[PDB]
Amino acid sequence: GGTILVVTGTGTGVGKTVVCAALASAARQAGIDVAVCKPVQTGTARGDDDLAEVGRLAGVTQLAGLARYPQPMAPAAAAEHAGMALPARDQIVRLIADLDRPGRLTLVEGAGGLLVELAEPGVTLRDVAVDVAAAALVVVTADLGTLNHTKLTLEALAAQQVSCAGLVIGSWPDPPGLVAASNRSALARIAMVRAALPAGAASLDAGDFAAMSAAAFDRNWVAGLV
Amino acid sequence: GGTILVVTGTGTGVGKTVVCAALASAARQAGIDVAVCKPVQTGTARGDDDLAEVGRLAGVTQLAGLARYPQPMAPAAAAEHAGMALPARDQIVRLIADLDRPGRLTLVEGAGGLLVELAEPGVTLRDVAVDVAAAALVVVTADLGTLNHTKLTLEALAAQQVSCAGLVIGSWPDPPGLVAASNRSALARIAMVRAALPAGAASLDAGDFAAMSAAAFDRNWVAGLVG
């Protein structure tokens, strides 16, 4: 094997994709080979291709996905509106397991949060984490409500002995703010904050984004993932 | 004793307080004596006062607070900023037990979401629900992300064997989007949806708000909340 990391979020719109790109870019600059698997993509009718994002921002070429739905909804719901099933649990696990190879960091991006249905029946990114024995990196916000949402997510992780790889603040505001400031301390009292991605990092060009990414994560932690 | 519900939410800003007032109104219109409790209230320096809002909206007069903090932050961080400490778990529990009385529905409104620290160390509303054998009513949104947030909250309730009294959609749009209609149907498969309060329910005078509250819930279920 190499290392398989599931990247989940406490909710939607928390910067998960750009965190996957950022971790991917940091890891590549450390010489680690990186693949990203986004099994289920939604909101595609309005352009959303998160794998393309990762490719543009981090230069990953091993970008694997099974299903794209047009509606900007949860996978299960976008499928319902499309009249088409979700992929199967085996499809998602086999695809990920086949991506994984010595020396490669395989990132597994979820859709929305940890417990959103990814495959039939009712199987989540948490289920997939168990099947492939992956730790979970949790993308969190710095806003009010993040501690409840983070504590909820890590509880859900721990109920199935899914290890928490740490937290990444998806968007760090400038200037921080009192709440943001306080949450960043509170967050690190309950897990390792691997990174706080500066607000606006999604807009950077590739070279800037790689400079940002390499500076946002601890060098030793990244290279230690494989 | 009586019936004690804790009223929590999947997050902050999902409409908890307006849901207490709406349930409070519906139960008082049912001839049920209602008390509303708010052990930790932050944002007082902003004018935040959820006990007062509940009374203003549902005419509930039995209103019980305990901890008040100026900054609109999580209780722990509001405490630290004001130089104060959070109450203790037994202080919160004491405040609730003192209101519990047969034929009375005591609502315990949380600060933020279920796992918001209310007391040291890491004591949450979930623990307080255990201590007083309360069910949780969970206030949700119709917005995307809600199914995940709701499953996490019910999962955390069940992990401590706190019964889920059900869900209330804090704000229900008129008319509802494809995302809102989808989530509501999906939410109703997770747990019973006791009410979906119309959007802007907080801007109703006492008359319109009482008529909304009475329409929002099932009479049967409200009446059945307390013997």
Side-chain angles (χ1 to χ4, degrees), chain A, chain B residues 1-79 81-227:
Chain A
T3 306
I4 304 165
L5 236 209
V6 304
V7 179
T8 192
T10 60
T12 328
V14 303
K16 200 210 304 100
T17 297
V18 43
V19 167
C20 285
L23 182 48
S25 162
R28 289 191 70 233
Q29 290 178 82
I32 295 168
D33 187 51
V34 181
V36 177
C37 181
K38 173 91 167 194
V40 176
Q41 176 88 60
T42 55
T44 68
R46 57 177 194 181
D48 303 22
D49 184 24
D50 299 335
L51 289 172
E53 273 272 287
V54 176
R56 204 187 70 252
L57 290 172
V60 180
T61 66
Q62 307 312 111
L63 304 162
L66 295 172
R68 309 185 196 179
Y69 298 90
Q71 287 297 332
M73 307 179 185
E80 202 179 31
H81 182 96
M84 286 168 269
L86 288 173
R89 174 167 193 155
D90 289 336
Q91 269 182 288
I92 302 188
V93 178
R94 246 101 82 134
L95 175 63
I96 294 159
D98 296 339
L99 283 174
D100 163 54
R101 58 176 67 180
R104 165 175 294 182
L105 185 61
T106 299
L107 298 186
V108 189
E109 187 174 325
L114 176 63
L115 298 182
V116 339
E117 190 181 28
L118 250 37
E120 231 106 333
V123 6
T124 58
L125 184 57
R126 182 170 64 179
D127 299 307
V128 175
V130 175
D131 296 356
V132 305
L137 195 69
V138 178
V139 180
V140 308
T141 85
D143 307 326
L144 194 71
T146 186
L147 300 175
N148 172 60
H149 281 169
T150 301
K151 277 164 82 173
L152 284 180
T153 293
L154 303 208
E155 274 211 19
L157 280 184
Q160 309 280 7
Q161 294 111 84
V162 182
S163 166
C164 180
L167 314 179
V168 183
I169 307 198
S171 184
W172 184 239
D174 191 56
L178 262 309
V179 169
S182 174
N183 284 339
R184 185 153 180 187
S185 280
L187 282 167
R189 266 182 286 271
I190 74 208
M192 297 257 67
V193 180
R194 304 301 175 194
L197 290 203
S203 283
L204 303 172
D205 73 21
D208 288 346
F209 191 90
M212 186 282 294
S213 292
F217 295 89
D218 188 78
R219 168 197 88 188
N220 295 340
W221 177 74
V222 174
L225 292 170
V226 203
Chain B
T3 297
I4 308 169
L5 286 200
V6 319
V7 176
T8 186
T10 59
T12 191
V14 316
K16 242 187 318 308
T17 314
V18 178
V19 162
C20 292
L23 180 62
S25 183
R28 284 166 35 117
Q29 295 184 65
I32 294 162
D33 175 53
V34 175
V36 183
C37 178
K38 179 92 189 186
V40 181
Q41 168 83 69
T42 56
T44 60
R46 188 171 70 181
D48 287 355
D49 190 326
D50 297 336
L51 284 182
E53 181 65 0
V54 163
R56 178 183 77 69
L57 280 169
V60 167
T61 51
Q62 300 172 152
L63 299 156
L66 167 64
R68 298 176 63 93
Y69 303 113
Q71 287 311 305
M73 329 170 77
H81 183 272
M84 312 167 62
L86 296 169
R89 175 180 187 160
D90 44 78
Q91 284 177 301
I92 295 160
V93 172
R94 174 182 175 188
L95 160 73
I96 298 157
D98 284 349
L99 305 159
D100 192 18
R101 186 226 90 178
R104 167 182 295 181
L105 178 69
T106 295
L107 307 177
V108 185
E109 180 162 342
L114 188 53
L115 288 199
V116 160
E117 183 185 37
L118 261 39
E120 211 168 63
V123 182
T124 70
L125 189 68
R126 177 172 62 183
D127 302 304
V128 178
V130 174
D131 289 346
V132 304
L137 180 74
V138 187
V139 184
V140 309
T141 77
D143 301 324
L144 78 168
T146 186
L147 306 175
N148 174 62
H149 282 154
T150 298
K151 288 187 166 208
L152 294 154
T153 302
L154 299 208
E155 225 185 74
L157 287 178
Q160 220 57 19
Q161 312 242 331
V162 173
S163 189
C164 187
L167 316 171
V168 186
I169 296 170
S171 189
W172 182 247
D174 176 53
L178 266 59
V179 168
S182 181
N183 282 328
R184 174 167 192 173
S185 161
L187 286 159
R189 287 187 295 255
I190 294 174
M192 293 275 284
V193 174
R194 304 305 190 185
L197 299 195
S203 293
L204 299 171
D205 53 58
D208 289 337
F209 191 95
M212 179 276 310
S213 298
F217 302 85
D218 182 19
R219 286 113 309 255
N220 289 2
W221 175 69
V222 179
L225 275 185
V226 56

